[PDB]
Amino acid sequence: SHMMVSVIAKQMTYKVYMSGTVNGHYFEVEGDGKGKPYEGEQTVKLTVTKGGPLPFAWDILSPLFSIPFTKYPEDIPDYVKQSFPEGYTWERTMNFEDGAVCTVSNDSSIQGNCFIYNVKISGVNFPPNGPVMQKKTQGWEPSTERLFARDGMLIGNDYMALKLEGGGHYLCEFKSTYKAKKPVRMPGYHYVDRKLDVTSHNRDYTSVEQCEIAIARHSLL
Amino acid sequence: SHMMVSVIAKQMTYKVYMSGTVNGHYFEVEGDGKGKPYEGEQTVKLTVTKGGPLPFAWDILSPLFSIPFTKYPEDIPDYVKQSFPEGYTWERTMNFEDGAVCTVSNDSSIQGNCFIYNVKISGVNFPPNGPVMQKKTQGWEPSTERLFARDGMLIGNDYMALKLEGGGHYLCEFKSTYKAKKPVRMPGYHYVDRKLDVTSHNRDYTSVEQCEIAIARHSLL
Amino acid sequence: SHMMVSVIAKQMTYKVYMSGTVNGHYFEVEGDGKGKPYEGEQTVKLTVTKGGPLPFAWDILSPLFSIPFTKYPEDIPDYVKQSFPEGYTWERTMNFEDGAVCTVSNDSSIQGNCFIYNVKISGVNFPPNGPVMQKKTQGWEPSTERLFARDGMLIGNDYMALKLEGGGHYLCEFKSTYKAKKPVRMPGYHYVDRKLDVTSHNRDYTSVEQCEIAIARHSLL
Amino acid sequence: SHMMVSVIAKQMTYKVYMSGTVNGHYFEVEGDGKGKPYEGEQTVKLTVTKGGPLPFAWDILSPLFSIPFTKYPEDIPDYVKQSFPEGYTWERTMNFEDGAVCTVSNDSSIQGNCFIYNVKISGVNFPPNGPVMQKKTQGWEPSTERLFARDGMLIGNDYMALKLEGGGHYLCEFKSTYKAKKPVRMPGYHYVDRKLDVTSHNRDYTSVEQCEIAIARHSLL
């Protein structure tokens, strides 16, 4: 079994606060979630508190609403979990195959049994007739992030794909940079498999429930 | 002489309001500017009003503070000036050669003799020992933007370069998408030459003055 | 068990013919290999026949010397194996994180018990003091290609990483496009895990022996 | 007037030898050219000699057929002309907006009154229904290359655009790296304007004539 850290219970909740701008439209979202950090399981309920209903696909926000909830096997150092109680920050670029770009920054803290995430997203050049502004997406495929240490930062790359109405895929590249706020034991080259689903939502996606499973590992061969 | 639009005087002022995050650091800036829109000359005084003094090179913000102040020869339609009084928006990506990326959005309107600009920037993945975080930049080379029409929008690209303390250059690619808030007459493929200098600043760059000359043209050949 | 095709025996050999140019240096390589296509196992012995010894790292050529040797599970259509006897072509871009770029094209045929591969590589902008021209690489990490169907072509993306002398990683992005020469049954979204090793070589890598294991699969979750 | 190097006459000829592969199709081309190097004027007659008639737009080859024929004002050092008699090499990437990519390498020498060019191109991932494979291009816009010195090499970038049958543009980014075969005096940051036209061709573009004007300069402001 993997070393559990005492500041992170086997059952934890969290609060997430998002603000951002996508194609010039400002908006804010708040969520409360919960899960089992050492099993890699979590769920979150989101509420659009400003700028709703959103004129773009909800799916582009889904993977922005909790990386402490990743199951790590015994021999792989868990970068993110070691960073607590002080916490971590990360920065992410999303490059969509039709030219749209998002930049994302996150600050993560802990208060007792509850993680606190603050996240900002900026999105530009989503084509007006594209699957995002026309809400043609049907959730992400499961995906695998490739992670490795560099300058005491963790670096993640992920080939993502939104499912399209009536077959087809809309590609997105994730590049992520994770920075603990204190020095920790770096892991080596490894992967995290993820599966993310919207399990329920209202008509204009102003209330949304998501859930995720994330499990780290070495190569299979 | 180029046609002059009655809603834009030969001398104008403007106010610019900017908020943003760069490597996770929030900041706000306000500016007051003036110039001669049909001669392509302007100056602006900027004040950091939140999150100052900034921990990053001022030069990455410089080109975000007024495209109505571009001189257009008579035979080239002026996309930006035609958009008034309704105004315009634009979005910009900034891709630096060490992998930092900025997304920018802008909304621009007019009140009498005064343009009003609202601009938001999100910049991520500046290397902590690179010339931006170590404030080693020494202003921008004069540059040229290539512009053409597509789908009712004016598309621009610019290979920019920052000057480096100790000679040499730090490269940045600009991609811009300008969208008038009403249909306007579309120009053909053309160029805009620009020179942009910081003419004065205090020690921690919390007060900065910039001067810019911008002139559109056809190919020189 | 997966459907085996009659034109592809459980034990097969192959011949591979490479010519190319890397940083302006022309060279040619020939290899003979063998393996078990339905088990995903193969080995190949390469000989540099022109332009040797090569002034660059052998590792940049390794993943160019046999995709019929991929183990597919029963329920996933095997695009490449269906394309025979007529065969297939593919095109690949390799984008290295220090700016170097390779383009690759391949034509694959079959004669009896022996596949025949013709491959061309063009490589440019490898920095003269980089790990490639200074031969600092220490083989690839195992990796996973993400594959999906589009316009009856198969499309693969792979986040690759060369191991560096004294710790460290040198990243490379693979984008591949595979085209059967006759229509076949397209698969859905899936992955291929690969592990590629140089098992033996002489002093200046003019004779090189490699081996590979490649196994397709769905997501693990 | 700019200094004139004694090894380069006011009128010169040149031979150009080209081989390459585009979407897997091999071809060779030979050309004979002439012009006035210090005035920046040249013409060239090309003959497809293998793999003709070409199944792809001739325009993607056009800018690969002689940079000594660039007029340099007196105060800007001429990197290419100083390199002689030894000569130079260069490498170029061509990135089209629908994801096609070309890598190019060149070697250039001199025999008396005649430059000799050897050039290789590899182009991949042209979409089969795009304007290159469907021969819908109508020549290149006049363009400007940005040039600066780094590590003894002259680096160039150019936002190019092909004209499209039916108005509109198909964008391509040029990155070029020019390397003299001996140390030379390095120019500062500057530009080269170019116009390149096909002046005549037969029906299947197996004989083509091109004309190019190239003039270096500082920023216009």
Author numbering:
A (entry chain A), B (entry chain B), C (entry chain A), D (entry chain B): -2 to 62, 66 to 221
What does the paper say about this structure?
Fluorescent proteins (FPs) are widely used as optical probes in molecular and cell biology. tKeima is a tetrameric, large Stokes shift red fluorescent protein and the ancestral protein of mt-Keima, which is widely applied as a pH-sensitive fluorescent probe. Accordingly, LSS FPs are useful in multicolor imaging experiments, such as those using two-photon laser scanning microscopy, dual-color fluorescence cross-correlation spectroscopy, and FRET. tKeima is one such LSS FP, with maximum excitation and emission wavelengths of 440 and 616 nm, respectively. tKeima is the ancestor of mitochondria-targeted Keima (mt-Keima), mKeima, and dKeima. While the pH sensitivity of mt-Keima is well characterized, the pH-dependent properties of the ancestral tKeima have not been comprehensively elucidated.
To obtain a better understanding of the effect of pH on fluorescence emission, the crystal structure of tKeima at pH 4.0 was determined at a resolution of 2.2 Å. The crystal of tKeimapH4.0 belongs to the P21212 space group, with two molecules in the asymmetric unit. These two tKeimapH4.0 molecules form a tetrameric structure with neighboring symmetry mates in the crystal packing. Analysis of the electron density map revealed that the chromophore of tKeimapH4.0 adopts both cis and trans conformations. Occupancy refinement showed that the occupancies of the cis and trans conformations of the chromophore in tKeima molecule A were 0.52 and 0.48, respectively, with B-factors of 32.17 and 31.47 Å2. Meanwhile, for tKeima molecule B, the corresponding occupancies were 0.58 and 0.42, respectively, with B-factors of 30.15 and 30.06 Å2. In the cis conformation of both molecule A and molecule B of tKeimapH4.0, the hydroxyl group of the tyrosine ring of the chromophore is stabilized by hydrogen bonding with the OG atom of Ser143 and a water molecule, at distances of 3.10/2.27 Å (molecule A/B) and 1.83/2.12 Å, respectively. In the trans conformation of both molecule A and molecule B of the tKeima chromophore, the hydroxyl group of the tyrosine ring of the chromophore is stabilized by hydrogen bonds with the OE2 atom of Glu145, the OD2 atom of Asp158, and water molecules, at distances of 3.06/3.15 (molecules A/B), 2.99/3.38, and 2.64/2.37 Å, respectively. In the previously determined tKeimapH8.0, a partial Fo-Fc electron density map in the trans conformation region was observed, but it was unsuitable for model building due to insufficient Fo-Fc electron density. This suggested the almost exclusive existence of the cis conformation of the tKeimapH8.0 chromophore, whereas tKeimapH4.0 showed both cis and trans conformations. Based on the spectroscopic and structural analyses, the cis and trans conformations of tKeima represent the fluorescent and nonfluorescent forms of the tKeima chromophore, respectively.
